[PDB]
Design a protein around this motif. Structure first.
Motif, PDB file in Angstrom:
ATOM      1  N   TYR B  54       0.802  -1.218   0.000  1.00 31.05           N
ATOM      2  CA  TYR B  54       0.000   0.000   0.000  1.00 31.05           C
ATOM      3  C   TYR B  54       0.836   1.270   0.000  1.00 31.05           C
ATOM      4  N   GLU B  55       2.157   1.152   0.138  1.00 31.26           N
ATOM      5  CA  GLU B  55       3.055   2.274  -0.096  1.00 31.26           C
ATOM      6  C   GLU B  55       3.637   2.250  -1.513  1.00 31.26           C
ATOM      7  N   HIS B  56       3.310   1.213  -2.293  1.00 29.73           N
ATOM      8  CA  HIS B  56       3.897   0.942  -3.605  1.00 29.73           C
ATOM      9  C   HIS B  56       5.421   0.817  -3.539  1.00 29.73           C
ATOM     10  N   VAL B  57       5.937   0.093  -2.539  1.00 28.06           N
ATOM     11  CA  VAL B  57       7.352  -0.270  -2.575  1.00 28.06           C
ATOM     12  C   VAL B  57       7.500  -1.781  -2.430  1.00 28.06           C
ATOM     13  N   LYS B  58       6.392  -2.511  -2.538  1.00 31.02           N
ATOM     14  CA  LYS B  58       6.459  -3.965  -2.604  1.00 31.02           C
ATOM     15  C   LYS B  58       7.106  -4.398  -3.915  1.00 31.02           C
ATOM     16  N   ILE B  59       8.044  -5.348  -3.842  1.00 27.28           N
ATOM     17  CA  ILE B  59       8.880  -5.710  -4.981  1.00 27.28           C
ATOM     18  C   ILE B  59       8.729  -7.181  -5.339  1.00 27.28           C
ATOM     19  N   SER B  60       9.210  -7.506  -6.545  1.00 28.78           N
ATOM     20  CA  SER B  60       9.233  -8.839  -7.154  1.00 28.78           C
ATOM     21  C   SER B  60       7.839  -9.404  -7.428  1.00 28.78           C
ATOM     22  N   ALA B  61       6.992  -9.514  -6.413  1.00 28.91           N
ATOM     23  CA  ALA B  61       5.680 -10.109  -6.610  1.00 28.91           C
ATOM     24  C   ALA B  61       4.736  -9.560  -5.556  1.00 28.91           C
ATOM     25  N   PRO B  62       3.425  -9.570  -5.820  1.00 25.46           N
ATOM     26  CA  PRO B  62       2.448  -9.171  -4.781  1.00 25.46           C
ATOM     27  C   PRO B  62       2.042 -10.359  -3.907  1.00 25.46           C
ATOM     28  N   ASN B  63       2.960 -10.790  -3.057  1.00 27.10           N
ATOM     29  CA  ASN B  63       2.783 -12.017  -2.294  1.00 27.10           C
ATOM     30  C   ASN B  63       2.843 -11.806  -0.787  1.00 27.10           C
ATOM     31  N   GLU B  64       2.847 -10.564  -0.306  1.00 25.70           N
ATOM     32  CA  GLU B  64       2.771 -10.328   1.133  1.00 25.70           C
ATOM     33  C   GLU B  64       2.040  -9.019   1.378  1.00 25.70           C
ATOM     34  N   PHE B  65       0.926  -9.080   2.099  1.00 22.26           N
ATOM     35  CA  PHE B  65       0.078  -7.931   2.407  1.00 22.26           C
ATOM     36  C   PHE B  65      -0.012  -7.765   3.917  1.00 22.26           C
ATOM     37  N   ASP B  66      -0.068  -6.527   4.386  1.00 19.93           N
ATOM     38  CA  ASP B  66      -0.169  -6.257   5.815  1.00 19.93           C
ATOM     39  C   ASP B  66      -1.420  -5.452   6.087  1.00 19.93           C
ATOM     40  N   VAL B  67      -2.232  -5.897   7.041  1.00 18.83           N
ATOM     41  CA  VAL B  67      -3.459  -5.168   7.330  1.00 18.83           C
ATOM     42  C   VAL B  67      -3.603  -5.043   8.839  1.00 18.83           C
ATOM     43  N   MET B  68      -3.984  -3.863   9.280  1.00 17.61           N
ATOM     44  CA  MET B  68      -4.178  -3.584  10.691  1.00 17.61           C
ATOM     45  C   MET B  68      -5.653  -3.742  11.011  1.00 17.61           C
ATOM     46  N   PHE B  69      -5.970  -4.583  11.984  1.00 20.32           N
ATOM     47  CA  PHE B  69      -7.302  -4.591  12.592  1.00 20.32           C
ATOM     48  C   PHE B  69      -7.173  -3.817  13.889  1.00 20.32           C
ATOM     49  N   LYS B  70      -7.619  -2.563  13.874  1.00 19.19           N
ATOM     50  CA  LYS B  70      -7.394  -1.625  14.961  1.00 19.19           C
ATOM     51  C   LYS B  70      -8.672  -1.438  15.775  1.00 19.19           C
ATOM     52  N   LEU B  71      -8.500  -1.255  17.077  1.00 16.39           N
ATOM     53  CA  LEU B  71      -9.629  -1.149  17.993  1.00 16.39           C
ATOM     54  C   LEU B  71      -9.406   0.049  18.901  1.00 16.39           C
ATOM     55  N   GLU B  72     -10.319   1.022  18.846  1.00  8.43           N
ATOM     56  CA  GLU B  72     -10.191   2.216  19.669  1.00  8.43           C
ATOM     57  C   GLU B  72     -10.432   1.870  21.128  1.00  8.43           C
ATOM     58  N   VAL B  73      -9.480   2.208  21.990  1.00 15.02           N
ATOM     59  CA  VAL B  73      -9.639   2.015  23.432  1.00 15.02           C
ATOM     60  C   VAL B  73      -9.507   3.364  24.132  1.00 15.02           C
ATOM     61  N   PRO B  74     -10.586   3.901  24.649  1.00 16.98           N
ATOM     62  CA  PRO B  74     -10.495   5.220  25.275  1.00 16.98           C
ATOM     63  C   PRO B  74     -10.174   5.107  26.764  1.00 16.98           C
ATOM     64  N   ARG B  75      -9.664   6.191  27.355  1.00 19.58           N
ATOM     65  CA  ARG B  75      -9.280   6.239  28.763  1.00 19.58           C
ATOM     66  C   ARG B  75      -8.196   5.221  29.074  1.00 19.58           C
ATOM     67  N   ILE B  76      -7.047   5.410  28.457  1.00 18.15           N
ATOM     68  CA  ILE B  76      -5.946   4.475  28.551  1.00 18.15           C
ATOM     69  C   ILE B  76      -4.827   5.151  29.324  1.00 18.15           C
ATOM     70  N   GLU B  77      -4.261   4.437  30.283  1.00 20.35           N
ATOM     71  CA  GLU B  77      -2.984   4.824  30.855  1.00 20.35           C
ATOM     72  C   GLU B  77      -1.894   3.892  30.357  1.00 20.35           C
ATOM     73  N   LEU B  78      -0.705   4.444  30.132  1.00 20.18           N
ATOM     74  CA  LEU B  78       0.471   3.677  29.746  1.00 20.18           C
ATOM     75  C   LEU B  78       1.525   3.706  30.841  1.00 20.18           C
ATOM     76  N   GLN B  79       2.267   2.615  30.949  1.00 16.17           N
ATOM     77  CA  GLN B  79       3.501   2.620  31.713  1.00 16.17           C
ATOM     78  C   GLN B  79       4.589   2.131  30.787  1.00 16.17           C
TER      79      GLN B  79
END
Ligand SMILES: Nc1ncnc2c1ncn2[C@@H]1O[C@H](COP(=O)(O)OP(=O)(O)OP(=O)(O)O)[C@@H](O)[C@H]1O
Ligand SMILES: Nc1ncnc2c1ncn2[C@@H]1O[C@H](COP(=O)(O)OP(=O)(O)OP(=O)(O)O)[C@@H](O)[C@H]1O
Ligand SMILES: [Mn+2]
Ligand SMILES: [Mn+2]
Ligand SMILES: [Mn+2]
Ligand SMILES: [Mn+2]
Ligand SMILES: [Zn+2]
Ligand SMILES: [Zn+2]
Lengths: 348, 356
Positions: B54-79
């Motif tokens: 999806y950046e058009h820098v995949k080379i040789s063949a279209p044989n590997e795709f990456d897809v994000m299944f993203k989930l919004e989580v509100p009110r998050i603290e990180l450490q």
DNA sequence: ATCTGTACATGTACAGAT
DNA sequence: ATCTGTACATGTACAGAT
DNA sequence: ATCTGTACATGTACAGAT
DNA sequence: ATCTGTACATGTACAGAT
């Protein structure tokens, strides 16, 4: 060096900006509250600041502000008025108003007028209505004179009208991606408030692209870094200020120029920015020649009586219909003079 | 000219793109729909295509795709996990369909990825259109990888990701240094976009193993890859072509060819070359430093830059400056000197591995 | 009856094909 | 050079739900 | 729905450096 | 004379709370 000194004169003062803004924002927020804080026909109107002050090309004083009150209105059909390009009939709350611009503007106007009557902390009145203005204009003194144009606009979220299909020719300047995104934004319609006596004059609206012009003014380089803290300065805005100043000083002296406005200068310089896209063609070291070739471009429009709407290319802002040939020749003589004499009018 | 022809070999065929994209979108869209069913804990996840294709820098063949299944989580603290900059514990503030993955308020990556994977697996078992199975879980991977035999083999990484809309973590305040390249307005807008956390999933044995998450900036990198010029018209129909992505492809391919032969290079991955060229693009902001006429020397300087990273054991994460992908704890000197020698050899001998 | 999550409808930058 | 398939952003319709 | 809180763009203003 | 760095100011987009 002369022009450097003029641009110092034209520069707004931080104090002036702070004092006028705090009073302008008081009044606008108040008119704004009323428009929805009531079962009025315009509940859901939102504010959109436009014009020179918000583009940072206002000169001399912060004494004139433009605000759009834009109303999202769905599923409307446009009809181009007699192939003008920029004027349209609108068809399908608002059913108290085919949507007549006259009818809607005056109820809008009636509401403003009523709130101004109930403002006791600011010296503010409503200027007498001007034919040709889609605005309700407030006059504020604190004690300085500031005028505010409250512009009623409809907001449509479909494809821009066909007459713009060849407008906004930024492809070699800001590029195709910026152009596509800009045309994904809504488009707006404002009242054509002439009194000329011609045909459907009362129900006609005019397209507005103030929101697109704002983005361009603040995203004006071919390089993304133009005029940013890690980029170079260009003198594009300074040229616009200088050319605006020249026309302002001329209109003060000459009633023959009443038919010209800043928007002509603005339209001209958008064309120049498109003809000369490279940021290096607007190096601050070349302010003088940049200003001159703007003057020369503006004179070529006058000479050929041709200055097309930057967004609606079939609409000639310099047609015989709108500005008399005599008027353009008058302005060409005065500019040609100021040019060949080192701009005496800049010293007063 | 020599490199012009390698690019033609690397160029994807529209026919291959069509067949691979037709299958891939079918499976992805069916997976995305099961996620929206029942009391599925992942209801509401949205799809984000990322990675080279999806950046058009995949080379040789279209044989590997990456897809994000993203989930919004509100009110998050990180450490932040031990000042590493890139790894985080996710905690919550209340006592939620993620209830089943909570420890002491701590959200388990390993638990929630397991459920996610179980749902995919079941959904795949059903697909009788396509020869598609679910790969054995790889340590360190945040993904559920599908292997499609389309006849041709095609990998798809379904990547599980949390989406927080707040400000990015302090560890990135000094990252993404695009001010003299794409500028401050672009930097401000980019950082107004959400940030993402994917499971680290390491299994090394270290404490907090199954509850650490790693930051992801795939979405920012996609924007950058497709808006890569100081000039707004770069690579556009009314602008000048650059060779920025062409250099990325050539570097990707040199690492791929080598990685295919020598298994010493197992710690290396294309993200390393991606990160190195974001730095080159920052170092050399002007589009004229990437003229297509000068493809040879642009590729050369990228190799020289990469060589210096390997020798000096230092390639900073473009978004997390304090994180060093080439640190001794991640790749030993012996692996970097081996790649250094292989790159110098290809450099100074006419790139014979481009002919294999 | 109206409401609305899902998905069609539209338009075009990107880059492969011819 | 032009033609053209995929991805993707945003506007809108409507079956099925309230 | 409305509104505050936050970050940083666009400015102006001026002293110290070049 | 201009350039640079810090201070001071307003505008604007949007997350999140109420
Ligand atoms: N004739 C016009 N056609 C279309 N849009 C116009 C026209 N006149 C004004 N506008 C829009 O309204 C805005 C405000 O116009 P206005 O007359 O206040 O001038 P300005 O550009 O704000 O500058 P200044 O007030 O400093 O002269 C313009 O910038 C433009 O977006
Ligand atoms: N080690 C990593 N650290 C951070 N982000 C990573 C890492 N590996 C991959 N990513 C992100 O996930 C994306 C997909 O990774 P992947 O390994 O499939 O490679 P790619 O960049 O898509 O290219 P290719 O698959 O053609 O080698 C990358 O573009 C990057 O945004
Ligand atoms: Mn104005
Ligand atoms: Mn005005
Ligand atoms: Mn990939
Ligand atoms: Mn992958
Ligand atoms: Zn500029
Ligand atoms: Zn480019």
């Amino acid at each position: 060096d002369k022009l450097k000194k003029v641009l110092d004169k034209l520069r707004l003062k931080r104090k002036d900006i702070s004092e006028a803004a705090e009073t302008v924002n008081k009044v606008v927020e108040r008119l704004l509250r009323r428009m929805q804080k009531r079962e009025s026909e315009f509940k859901g109107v939102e504010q959109l600041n436009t014009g020179s002050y918000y583009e940072h090309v206002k000169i001399s004083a912060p004494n004139e502000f433009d605000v759009m009150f834009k109303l999202e209105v769905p599923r409307i059909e446009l009809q181009e008025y007699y192939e003008t390009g920029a004027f349209y009939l609108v068809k399908f709350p608002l059913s108290h108003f085919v949507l007549s611009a006259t009818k809607m503007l005056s109820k809008f106007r009636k509401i403003i007028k009523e709130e101004v009557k109930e403002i006791k902390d600011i010296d503010v009145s409503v200027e007498k209505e001007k034919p040709g203005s889609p605005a309700v204009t407030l006059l504020i003194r604190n004690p300085e004179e500031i005028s505010v144009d409250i512009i009623l606009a409809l907001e449509s979220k479909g494809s821009w009208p066909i007459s713009t299909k060849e407008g906004l020719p930024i492809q070699g300047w800001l590029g195709t991606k910026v152009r596509t995104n800009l045309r994904r934004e809504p488009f707006y319609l404002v009242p054509k408030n002439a009194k000329d006596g011609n045909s459907f004059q009362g129900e006609t609206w005019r397209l507005s692209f103030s929101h697109t012009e704002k983005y361009i003014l603040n995203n004006h380089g071919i390089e993304k870094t133009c005029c940013e803290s890690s980029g170079a300065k260009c003198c594009r805005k300074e040229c616009l200020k200088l050319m605006k100043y020249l026309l302002e000083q001329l209109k003060k002296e000459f009633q023959e120029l009443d038919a010209f406005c800043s928007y002509h200068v603005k339209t001209a310089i958008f064309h120049m920015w498109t003809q000369d896209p490279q940021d290096s063609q607007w190096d601050p070291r070349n302010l003088s020649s940049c200003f001159d070739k703007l003057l020369a471009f503006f004179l070529e429009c006058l000479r050929t009586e041709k200055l097309d709407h930057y967004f609606i290319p079939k609409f000639n802002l310099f047609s015989q219909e709108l500005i008399d040939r005599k008027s353009k020749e008058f302005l060409s003589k005065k500019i040609e003079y100021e040019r060949n004499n080192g701009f005496p009018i800049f010293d007063k």
